[PDB]
A paper describes a structure:
In human mitochondria, [name] [name] ([name]) and the nucleotide exchange factor ([name]) work synergistically to stabilize proteins, assemble protein complexes, and facilitate protein import. In bacteria, mitochondria, and chloroplasts, the GrpE-family of NEFs interacts with substrate-bound [name] to facilitate ADP and protein substrate release. Herein, we present structures of full-length human [name] in a nucleotide-free and substrate-bound state in complex with full-length [name]. To stabilize the complex for structural analysis, we introduced a point mutation, [name], into [name] (mortalinR126W) that is associated with EVEN-PLUS syndrome and has been shown to reduce [name]’s ATPase activity and conformational flexibility.
Thus, we mutated Y173 in [name] to an alanine (GrpEL1Y173A) and performed cryoEM analysis on a mortalinR126W-GrpEL1Y173A complex. Our cryoEM analysis of mortalinR126W-GrpEL1Y173A yielded two distinct populations differentiated by the presence or lack of density for the [name]α lid. We term these structures mortalinR126W-GrpEL1Y173A and mortalinR126W-GrpEL1Y173A−lid. Overall, these structures closely resemble our mortalinR126W-GrpEL1WT structure and are similarly nucleotide-free. In our mortalinR126W-GrpEL1Y173A−lid structure, we discern diminished EM density for the IDL region and density only for the [name]β subdomain. Importantly, we are unable to identify EM density of bound substrate that is observed in our other mortalinR126W-[name] structures. Considering density for the [name]α subdomain is also absent in the mortalinR126W-GrpEL1Y173A−lid structure, we hypothesize that this complex harbors a disordered [name]α subdomain and may represent a post-substrate release state. Finally, the lack of [name]α density in our mortalinR126W-GrpEL1Y173A−lid structure suggests flexibility of the [name]α lid, especially in the absence of substrate.
Numbering used by the authors:
A (entry chain C): 59 to 217
B (entry chain A): 46 to 437, 441 to 559
C (entry chain B): 59 to 219
The structure:
């Protein structure tokens, strides 16, 4: 009777404390899963933003690089000022991109990398080692160490 | 007196003089909550419209120009202060709104023929943070911890307690700002020591010398500069940039407003940049319009120039520290730790000055912007609430699949007495033998992590692939004893495996 | 002493049962709050990026508005191409903004409301209803109902008479 009461109380206490510990352990694992899910959602949103954002920088860079530096003179005050403003806006755009992890890709004279570079064409070049970039057609971008868009680049072939 | 049966969440509200903050103890670390507009800070401004409204926060700063005689900003300078006091007498001239005398001789504020005490303004701001905390929590919060400056009297502490109580919030305990900073920096679980708290960056500068004897913090001396803060650094940089631009071209942006705003924001960005980078540049295309055309600003700013601009301000943080050391009756060798709080305690010149003044390298293990709120949340969680129970895994376990994928049957951070079950199908049609391989690791490849054991389940009725079901149940029990077994409903023939000791070669193999 | 020890044990059992129920309620609350946080981080999460690029968009708009619209001729063939490139870039950036919920706030004649508009001056304007916004100095932005940058307006004021 009373002797069995102590045994049953000890068993009930052990079961209740173990169930409490398991309930508390579920909260921590659920919290970690929630943090992972929130971070993954943030990453997906930022990636979706950057993928559409790259085209603005590409178009602006093409527009500014269209004009050569020979005719940018003080006798054309409406063109030198605009060119300077556009170059500074490009610098600002690149600064904001690299501030939020969006890294540019300008591998001039670097070793060819299939993951980070796209081989537009193969052409031997004198004085340059094969498999090394000789020119860059389009500048790619990298986000947090992953290639968001490979750079369309040329690879020196063997002559 | 028995247990209080809190059954609620305690939030630590940092009722600041300009910018407030609310933080809660999510699990093992204090988490600062963000308001509706996504910011981590609610400005302590309360304004009332002509008919009736209670715009608090950014919607109260934004409309300040159209409502200049009703917006109450930085009312923490009038809490618990009698009307016939030197501080209120000096303050009344500057504030556009009317500070009036109350019946009980208290400095109150006026709005559209209705009397508000300085406690009630803080009560409204506390209601705002209560809403922004209930939004995150989901359920209402009743008990809270609100922090006050270390120089507050007992009357001001009572006034802040009343302000907390008015906003449907049973204030748990009123804490000191230096004590909350020490709690956030983690000096609560430390032996007897003497520390100093460097609070620079807000609207005011304050230095307080503490003492951690017997695990309880006792304030020894408090001092600081009334008219010094983090706004002066930005103003100095802004004025230098404006003067440099005027010298370079000939247009002063002081008469401009949009250009001034752009320059101010760029100055803030560069100042925040001139703490981990030696050199910075400021680009602001199309800053101003002139008859000759647009004008662009392009300044190259180095760390040395910035240090030389604000050297006087940092120099001004030297006499109060020495006076606080003198009144605390401790020399530069007694101080065993230095606590850095505030936004302006990040530039290396300030840290060098602090080290020179105290002789110790300052502790920068916690973001100084939100240390007071984090400490308040930690103290509120520890004092009341079942959080200290949760206060008290480099590898995981998996199995082998037909495709070789290292399926994660059990999680990594899981308690030992946990039982989980999973069902799996056969490999191919006509298969009669099912083999399960046990391994430990975190990479998604069974053979690339470890190789512990292998047991084969023999005997299943013939069936097309995908129809047979085999249930894998893990019965790890007690502490360190692992039970791995597979159950199938076809034939009553299972297999066992030991896997009692794993990961014996704990070395850089994972790395 | 055994009787009071067993009474204390039973009280502890009741307390731990209540605490277990509290833990179950807490994990349910965590599930709901996690769902809400995941949804919010799905919607927002480009807040810092957009708040940074607002100035690039403003600069491009100012560049489109600053050329005097008279020297874009065949006498200046290279200036014309640069202006066309700038216009195309501005249009593309405004197309990217609109896709991700960015809606420029341009209350030309709407009613002032502090939740979205930041007042810059209180100049009275004759012929305009009091409480409306006279002009928009800078077009603010907002995404999914969250005002990233307020539109800097000038609110009209009732006449002194």
């Amino acid at each position: 009777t009373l002797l069995e009461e102590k045994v049953k109380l000890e068993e009930q206490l052990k079961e209740t404390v173990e169930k409490y510990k398991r309930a508390l352990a579920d909260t921590e694992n659920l919290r970690q899963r929630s943090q992972k899910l929130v971070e993954e959602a943030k990453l997906y949103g930022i990636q979706a933003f950057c993928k559409d954002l790259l085209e603005v920088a590409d178009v602006l860079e093409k527009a500014t690089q269209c004009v050569p530096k020979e005719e940018i003179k003080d006798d054309n005050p409406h063109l030198k000022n605009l060119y300077e403003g556009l170059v500074m806006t490009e610098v600002q755009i690149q600064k904001v991109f690299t501030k939020h992890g969006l890294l540019k890709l300008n591998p001039v004279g670097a070793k060819f990398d299939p993951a980070e570079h796209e081989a537009l064409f193969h052409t031997p070049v004198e004085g340059k080692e094969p498999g090394t970039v000789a020119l860059v057609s389009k500048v790619g971008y990298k986000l947090h160490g992953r290639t968001l868009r490979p750079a369309l680049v040329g690879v020196v072939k063997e002559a | 007196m028995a247990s209080e049966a809190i059954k609620g969440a305690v939030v630590g509200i940092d009722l600041g003089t300009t910018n407030s903050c609310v933080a809660v103890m999510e699990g093992k670390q204090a988490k600062v909550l963000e308001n509706a507009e996504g910011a981590r800070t609610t400005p302590s401004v309360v304004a009332f419209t002509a008919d009736g409204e209670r715009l608090v926060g950014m919607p109260a700063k934004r409309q300040a120009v159209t409502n200049p005689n009703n917006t109450f900003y930085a009312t923490k300078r009038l809490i618990g202060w009698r009307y016939d006091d030197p501080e209120v007498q000096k303050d009344i001239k500057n504030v556009p709104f009317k500070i009036v005398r109350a019946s009980n001789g208290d400095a109150w504020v006026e709005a559209h023929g209705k009397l508000y005490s300085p406690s009630q303004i803080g009560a409204f701001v506390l209601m705002k943070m209560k809403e922004t905390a209930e939004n995150y929590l989901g359920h209402t919060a009743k008990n809270a911890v609100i922090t006050v400056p270390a120089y507050f009297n007992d009357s001001q502490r009572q006034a802040t307690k009343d302000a907390g109580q008015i906003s449907g919030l049973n204030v748990l305990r009123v804490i000191n700002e230096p004590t909350a900073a020490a709690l956030a920096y983690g000096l609560d679980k430390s032996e007897d020591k003497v520390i100093a708290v460097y609070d620079l960056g807000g609207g005011t500068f304050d230095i307080s010398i503490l003492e951690i004897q017997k695990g309880v913090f006792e304030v020894k001396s408090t001092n600081g500069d009334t008219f010094l803060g983090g706004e002066d650094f930005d103003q100095a940089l802004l004025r230098h940039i404006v003067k440099e631009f005027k010298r370079e071209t000939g247009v002063d942006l002081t008469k401009d407003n949009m250009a001034l705003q752009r320059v101010r924001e760029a100055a803030e960005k560069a100042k925040c940049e001139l703490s981990s980078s030696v050199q910075t540049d400021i680009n602001l295309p199309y800053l101003t319009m002139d008859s000759s055309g647009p004008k662009h600003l392009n300044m190259k700013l180095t760390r040395a120039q910035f240090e030389g601009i604000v050297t006087d301000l940092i120099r001004r943080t030297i006499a109060p520290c020495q006076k606080a050391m003198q009144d605390a009756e401790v020399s530069k060798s007694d101080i065993g730790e230095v606590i850095l709080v505030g936004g302006m305690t990040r530039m290396p010149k300030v840290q060098q000055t602090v080290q020179d003044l105290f002789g110790r390298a300052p502790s920068k293990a916690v973001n100084p912007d939100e240390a007071v709120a984090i400490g308040a949340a930690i103290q509120g969680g520890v004092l009341a609430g079942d959080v200290t129970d949760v206060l008290l895994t480099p590898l995981s376990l998996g199995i082998e699949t037909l495709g070789g994928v290292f399926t994660k049957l059990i999680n990594r951070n899981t308690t030992i007495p946990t039982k989980k079950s999973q069902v799996f199908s056969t490999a191919a049609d006509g298969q009669t033998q099912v083999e399960i391989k046990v391994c430990q690791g975190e990479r998604e490849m069974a053979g690339d992590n470890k190789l512990l054991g292998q047991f084969t389940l023999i005997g299943i009725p013939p069936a097309p692939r995908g129809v047979p079901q085999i249930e894998v149940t893990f019965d790890i029990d007690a502490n360190g004893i692992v039970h791995v077994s597979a159950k199938d409903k076809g034939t009553g023939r299972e297999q066992q495996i030991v896997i009692q000791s794993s990961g014996g070669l704990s070395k850089d193999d994972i790395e």
